Structures are given as C-alpha cells and as structure tokens.
Design a protein around this ligand. Structure first.
Ligand SMILES: [Cl-]
Lengths: 76, 77
DNA sequence: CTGTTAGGGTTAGGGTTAG
DNA sequence: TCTAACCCTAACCCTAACA
C-alpha cells in the first residue's frame, strides 16, 4: 500500500453514484460495464489511458464495498 | 502551551530511525518512544502525560514526516 | 470440491482540522 | 503562525456464508 494513491475524478464519481443508487452490489460484468463507463468519461482525445489512471473492475468493486461500509458506519 | 511539543533531542532520535525505515511497527515504535523518553527524562521527576512520548505520537510523527517530504518533493516540481 | 464475495478487519497517501 | 492529531478512503487481508 506504499505506492502513490489513486484519486477518483469528480466525473467518475458521478457515474459511480448513478450506478450505486440503482444497485449497490454490481456483479463482475456490471463492474466491467461501470469501469468502461468511467474510463470513457476521463480519457483525453488522442491519448491512451495510463495504467495508473484507468479504472478497472476491481477499483470499482473496492469503491462500492468501501462506500457501503462508510454508510453503515455513518448510520451508527 | 497545552499541546504536545517535540523536543529537539527526540526529533533527532526519531530522524535517526526515519532514515533507515519510515514505517516502524508497534514494537519498534515502543523502542523509539522509550529511547526518546530516556533522553528527555530528568532525575527524580515523572514525565507528565502531555510531554511523555508514546508509540502513537511516534506513529503520527512518522506519517506526518513522510507527508511533509512528499510535499517538499512536489514543491520542487 | 472449486470458486465468489460480503463485510469484519488493517495500512497508509493526500489533505484538513484543532489547540 | 505552526504542526500534532485527525479525517477520508483506496487497497488490500481474512473467514464465514454462500452457490
Ligand atoms: Cl495516515
């Protein structure tokens, strides 16, 4: 975990939250869908997405999981 | 004041460890803390809870140090 | 028997607060 | 002002409860 830390861009979070309200438990395929969705919003024309910037299904997973946890905790 | 303040000697000690490893575990942090206290400890005087060094404080400092460094890096870039 | 993952933890980067 | 303590949460580990 000592590597530089990834940041979710405001535009990705929108897609995320959109998909999150619909359903908070995306399956693998769904996560891939959301991943491509997010990438499509951030990729700059004419440039490939760096491996550090590209959203993967796993990032999406962890995001959902973490959010669920934060909510459950923030409900006392 | 009424907030914890790092004594120079303590900082020196901690820095000596920071240059070797920047992520000391609990046990190591105990060692470091005890080292610090030993130095700032005066005879026949119990160190007040505030000025007393603990593994948690060491932890906080190490983290803050790493972060300060990462800032200093971006400043020069 | 093989394979997934919820949700209980922890570690640590980038930033903000509080005294 | 100065910075120790804290906040948030990305990214992982672990085991029970499944399919
Ligand atoms: Cl931290």
């Amino acid at each position: 975990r000592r590597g530089s830390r990834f940041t979710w861009r405001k535009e990705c979070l929108a897609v995320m939250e959109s998909y999150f309200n619909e359903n908070q438990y995306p399956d693998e395929a769904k996560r891939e869908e959301i991943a491509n969705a997010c990438n499509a919003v951030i990729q700059k024309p004419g440039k490939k997405l760096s491996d550090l910037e590209r959203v993967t299904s796993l990032k999406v997973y962890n995001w959902f999981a973490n959010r669920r946890k934060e909510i459950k905790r923030r409900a006392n």
